[PDB]
Structures are given as C-alpha cells and as structure tokens.
C-alpha cells in the first residue's frame, strides 16, 4: 500500500523545516532578540521585502541598488533617440552591496511598464568596451492592462562590473528591429524613466562566506 499517517508527516516536515531554515541561515541557534529596535520595519526594508517577494543551498542576503537618476549628466548624451531606453548603474553602490564579487550568487534587473496595449519584442544590451554593446537577453512582451515587473538575469554582467573599477556602467533597453525592416521606435514606457528600475543582488553574506 505504501501508506503512512498524515499528522506524523506534518510534524516530521515542520521539524525538518525548522532544521532546514536554521541550516540555510547557518544559525547554530536562534539570534537573540534583545538588541532589536522597537517599532515596525523601516520603509526601505519593507520595500526591499516586497520586491523580493515579487551549491546554492544556503540563504543569500538581498540588497536593492537603484539606477542612476534620470536628471544626471551621464544620460544627457544619448537621451535624444526614442528607439532605445538607457539605464545606467553606479558600480560603487553595487560594490558597497557586494564587497567580494565571488559572493554574488545572482543578480536581477527588473523593469516596470506603465500600460502596454501593444505587443513589442524588446531587447537588452550591456554598455561594453569602447561604445559597443553585448547581447544579454530578450523577452517578447504581450499587451497588458496592469503594470508588470520584468526580470533579466544580469549576474555575469554585475560580476564583470564588480571585477572592474567603480564607475557608471549600465544597460540599453532597445526595441528589436528585424533585419529586413527599417528602424522602428520603442513603444513601451518604463516607469521611473519615461518606482524606477533597480537590481536585486543575491549575495552570500561576507560574515559567513
């Protein structure tokens, strides 16, 4: 029959879940709660937790680094064309988040669209050496009625950024022009450019590397 009781399996899992959560966090004991400030969580921590709700066994900390603001001098050199969206990130803040580049388990760049009633095949690049750009990935965008959060795996990109000097390095959010067609404009509007885009930095904490 291969049948076993229900209520034992629930307690056996709740205990194994206790063990698994205490082992991923590398906690030999629950942390002491005496040195915990009162009141609710800070709004930055709440926003980070809301964002992250939206041998890789162990738990990796989450840190949000926002893009360089639109009213910056780095953007007033290509912000005249309309067929691409330019996002630039400060590598100093990324290094402050992840001081040791081998600890970066995974990096995620998220985009938020306002309202897309048309289907557009969009495209993402990296600001590579000279002024050339490297392929990262593409996501076909079906039309929507509500704002939608995108996601790009830029872990290798942020690893190369951490393996380089602190500066301003970023991405290009471009429309896909087919090789038999003329240059078409990018019809999708990203929030915070046209809640601005950021990065999730899944990093092994440096205190338990």
């Amino acid at each position, epitope marked *: 029959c291969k049948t076993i009781d229900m209520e034992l399996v629930k307690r056996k899992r709740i205990e194994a879940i206790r063990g698994q959560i205490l082992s991923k966090l590398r906690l030999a004991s629950p942390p002491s709660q005496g040195e915990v400030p009162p009141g609710p969580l800070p709004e930055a921590v709440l926003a980070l937790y809301n964002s992250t709700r939206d041998a890789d066994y162990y738990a990796k900390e989450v840190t949000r680094v926002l893009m360089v603001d639109r009213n910056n001098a780095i953007y007033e050199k290509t912000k005249d064309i309309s067929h691409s969206i330019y996002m630039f990130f400060n590598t*100093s803040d990324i290094r402050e988040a992840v*001081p040791e580049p*081998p600890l970066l388990s995974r990096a995620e760049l998220r985009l938020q669209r306002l309202k897309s009633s048309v289907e557009q095949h969009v495209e993402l690049y990296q600001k590579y050496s*000279n002024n050339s750009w490297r392929y990262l990935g593409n996501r076909l965008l079906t039309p929507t009625d509500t704002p939608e959060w995108l996601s790009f795996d830029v872990t290798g990109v942020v690893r190369q950024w951490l393996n380089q000097g*602190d*500066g301003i390095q970023g991405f290009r959010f471009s429309a896909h022009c087919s090789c038999d067609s003329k240059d078409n404009k990018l019809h999708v509007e990203i929030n915070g450019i046209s809640n601005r885009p950021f990065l999730l930095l899944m990093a092994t904490p440096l205190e338990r590397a």
Partner: antibody, heavy 120, light 109 residues
Framework: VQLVESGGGLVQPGGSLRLSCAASGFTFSSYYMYWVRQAPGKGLEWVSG????????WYADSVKGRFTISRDNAKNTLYLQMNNLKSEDTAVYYCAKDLNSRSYKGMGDWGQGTQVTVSS | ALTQLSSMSGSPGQTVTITCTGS?????????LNWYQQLPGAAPKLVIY???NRASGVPDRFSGSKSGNLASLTITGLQAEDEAVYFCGCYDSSLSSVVFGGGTHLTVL
C-alpha cells in the same frame, strides 16, 4: 593610519620574494588592497590589487599570474609572493589602500616603499 | 595607456595645468581618475580623487577637471612645496588594470 612594509632585498634573477604590509589605523577587513611599483627614473606601475577577503585578485598583465597576491585579514597583513624575478622588476614597491571602504576606486593612503633589485 | 607630457616648468606663483588624455576606456569610460603627487624621496599622496574632488589633508590650491577623454589638474599658483612628479591614475576597460601616466616633472625657477 599607516601601512608599514617589509621584504626589501636583492634577489638573484629567476628567484622569488614575499613582501608584507602590516597595516594599522583603519579597518583592514573593510578596505581594498593594492600594490604599486616604480622603476628608478620611471613612473608608477600597478602591480596587483585584491578585494575584501582576498577572494578576487586583479593583476597587471605584465605580472599576471607570475606574481600572486594574498590577504590575511586576521593579522591586518598583506602578502605579494613574487616568482621568477628578472630585468625590469627592479623597482620600489608601494603598499596602498583605497580611499573609500567598500570600493575599487583609487588609492587613499600609501606606505613607504621597499627597494627590490633583481640584476645581480 | 594614459599619455601625459614628461617635463613641465613654470614660474613660482603662476597657475599651471597638468593634462593627461584617455582612450575612451581610461577616463571616457566613466571610471575614477585620481591624481597623485610624488615628492623626491617620498611616497605618492592622493591629491584629487574622482578627477574633480580634493582629498583630505591636501591644501586647497589643487583643483581637478574632467572633460571627455582629457583630465586636467590645475595647480592654482606655484610655491616651494610643489616640486613633485605628478601622476594621473585611473582604471581602464581595455587592459583591465589601473593605469598611471608618465609623470610630469613639475619644477620652479
């Protein structure tokens, strides 16, 4: 803040040598480490640079791999194990730390230099 | 590589500018240009960091400027304590190393 150095001495070409940078006055486990040399009568040249914990180490291509760097955050010390010394490696080697804590920006404070000669 | 003129001379009290040019990945890549002065028989010291910001402990007679692929360090005036070989150091995306210029032997009368 200071970064005293050691390991200066003549090396027969084809040999090896290990320096040390006993750093004090700053949080050594929270600053990126660098090595800089300059040949006498010439300009400064980057030797190697490493990160917090020594997990990621970055080198100039002229000494890439053939020199190795390491960090030991416990003793607040810094190591640079050279190998196979030859003609243009005769320089004075400078220990330096980045001006900001968790950054790979620049070189804030410098040591005093150790003179190594290779030609014998 | 970073290119800068080897020798420079100016009268004391005269503002003189040291310039080194990048290669669109040295300084044109948005990286951090730092300026270092090296007195004879002394260690290099940080003077200007991020190509325009004065360091700590430097007297406020040094100013830095960044323009495209060109880095300017402007020494307002000239005294008897500026006899040093000046270096501009910045990262690059080409050689993947921190590159220094060929230092300027700034002198006086």
């Amino acid at each position: 803040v200071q970064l005293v150095e050691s390991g200066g001495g003549l090396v027969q070409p084809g040999g090896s040598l290990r320096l040390s940078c006993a750093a004090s006055g700053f949080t050594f486990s929270s600053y990126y480490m660098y090595w800089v040399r300059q040949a006498p009568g010439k300009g400064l040249e980057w030797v190697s640079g490493t990160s917090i914990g020594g997990g990621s180490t970055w080198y100039a291509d002229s000494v890439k791999g053939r020199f190795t760097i390491s960090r030991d955050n416990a003793k607040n010390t810094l190591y640079l194990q050279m190998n196979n010394l030859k003609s243009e490696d005769t320089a004075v080697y400078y220990c330096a730390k980045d001006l900001n804590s968790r950054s790979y920006k620049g070189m804030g404070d410098w040591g005093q230099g150790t003179q190594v000669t290779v030609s014998s | 590589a970073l290119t800068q003129l080897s020798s420079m001379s100016g009268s004391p009290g005269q503002t003189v500018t040291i310039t080194c040019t990048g290669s669109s990945s040295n300084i044109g890549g948005g990286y951090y240009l730092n300026w270092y002065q090296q007195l004879p028989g002394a260690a290099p010291k940080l003077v200007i960091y991020n190509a325009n910001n004065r360091a700590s402990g430097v007297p406020d007679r040094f100013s830095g400027s960044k323009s495209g692929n060109l880095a300017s360090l402007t020494i307002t005036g000239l005294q008897a304590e500026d006899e040093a070989v000046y270096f501009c150091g910045c990262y690059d995306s080409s050689l993947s190393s921190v590159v220094f210029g060929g230092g300027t032997h700034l002198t006086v009368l």
